[PDB]
Amino acid sequence: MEKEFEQIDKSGSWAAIYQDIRHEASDFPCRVAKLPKNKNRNRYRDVSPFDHSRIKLHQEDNDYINASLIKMEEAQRSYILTQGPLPNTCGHFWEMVWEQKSRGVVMLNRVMEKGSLKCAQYWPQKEEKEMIFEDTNLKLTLISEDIKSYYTVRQLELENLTTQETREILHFHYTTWPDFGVPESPASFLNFLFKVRESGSASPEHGPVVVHCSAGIGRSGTFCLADTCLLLMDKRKDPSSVDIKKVLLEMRKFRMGLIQTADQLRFSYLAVIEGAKF
Ligand SMILES: [Cl-]
Ligand SMILES: [Cl-]
Ligand SMILES: [Cl-]
Ligand SMILES: [Cl-]
Ligand SMILES: [Cl-]
Numbered sequence: 001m002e003k004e005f006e007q008i009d010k011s012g013s014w015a016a017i018y019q020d021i022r023h024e025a026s027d028f029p030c031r032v033a034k035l036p037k038n039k040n041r042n043r044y045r046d047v048s049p050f051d052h053s054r055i056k057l058h059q060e061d062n063d064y065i066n067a068s069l070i071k072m073e074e075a076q077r078s079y080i081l082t083q084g085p086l087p088n089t090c091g092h093f094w095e096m097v098w099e100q101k102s103r104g105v106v107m108l109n110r111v112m113e114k115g116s117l118k119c120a121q122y123w124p125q126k127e128e129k130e131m132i133f134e135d136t137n138l139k140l141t142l143i144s145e146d147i148k149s150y151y152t153v154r155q156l157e158l159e160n161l162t163t164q165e166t167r168e169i170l171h172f173h174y175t176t177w178p179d180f181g182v183p184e185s186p187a188s189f190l191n192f193l194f195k196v197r198e199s200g201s202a203s204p205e206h207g208p209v210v211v212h213c214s215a216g217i218g219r220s221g222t223f224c225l226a227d228t229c230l231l232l233m234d235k236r237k238d239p240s241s242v243d244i245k246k247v248l249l250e251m252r253k254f255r256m257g258l259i260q261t262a263d264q265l266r267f268s269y270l271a272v273i274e275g276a277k278f
Contacts, residue, residue: 001240001276005269018262021245025252028052038064041092043083047215053254055080057092058099059136065092066216068255069208070224072247075231078208079224081255083216084109084119091133093122094140094158097169097210104170104201106211108219114179118214123156123171137161143168150176150188151195172196177219182267189267190275193227202227221258225251226271233276244269 008014032038033048041064042048048066049055055067066089067082080100084107085093097105109118123140124131130141143155154171174192176183183189196202202209213219225248232247233239248268251258259265 001242001244001269002273005273008266008269014262014266017245018259018265021248021252021259021265024249025256026249027256028253030256032064033066035064037062041086041089042066043086044215047083047217047257049255055082055096055100057095059095061135065089065096067096067210068216070251070254072228072231072250075228075235076204077202077228077231079227080208080210081216081220081224081258082210082212084212084214085122087120090120090122090131091136091138094133094138095136097207098136098138098158098160098167100210101207102169102210103167103203103206104172104196104199104209106196106201106209106220106223107171107173108177108211108213108223110175110177119212123154132161150174151192153195153199170199170201172199172201182222182261182263186267186271186274189222189226189271190278193223193230193271193275194278197227215257215260217255217257218260218264221248221251221255221260222264222268222271225259225268226275229268229272230275233272239276242272244272 028050030048032051049068053068056063067080070079111119124142127142132139139159139161141157143157145154152173156169156171157166158169159166211220211223229242229247232242
């Protein structure tokens, strides 16, 4: 696989490989995402979930959230990819986490990047200042946080104020993705991915891990694509038969636009190449 990478670099065809993926990617309707009543539930009018794979909210209200269930059958893992919650969709976001029984939330952006807001402050920064989402009847409390040099893991308690039931949610926040471009090295990103794995958050006993960046297709796509390919390499008899392009096209049946740049495609290959050694 490093041989294919080398040939693509020693030729400069990443732009070519990437545009072919764009051309071959699935197109399915997003009728619900584009309904007028959902205008303010979408961070980017150009990034919408497909109707067939969108996550539906269960409460008696508009069921819409910009989130997609990516179900990877051969790798036997599901992910929920979603946009960075908006100030008016944080309650919906946590309702989704509750209803989908997710145990982990993976965040790949800072709330502020290059001086701009990519995401709402959707979890509490202080133990004593919990967040109440009156619309969806949820309370979210910061229990503790383990701040590391390249990522933070937070223990959150999500309480359904309706049943008084509580659940521990792990919040995995990769905090050092560069402002521009992709990490020169996949080392940190891979260490982060393995930390999420060993937390048990992506275990099949839980709901799908929720993964988001700002639009939920770029860095998020890199995360899911790398994780899925590494799973496929541990399963197949011929690990080098894993075709990253084919995997990405499979994931793009479930959410449009996964991997936003040729650089992100190149980084994904690099992350799988390096992650396979370990
Ligand atoms: Cl909200
Ligand atoms: Cl942040
Ligand atoms: Cl930077
Ligand atoms: Cl494959
Ligand atoms: Cl695209």
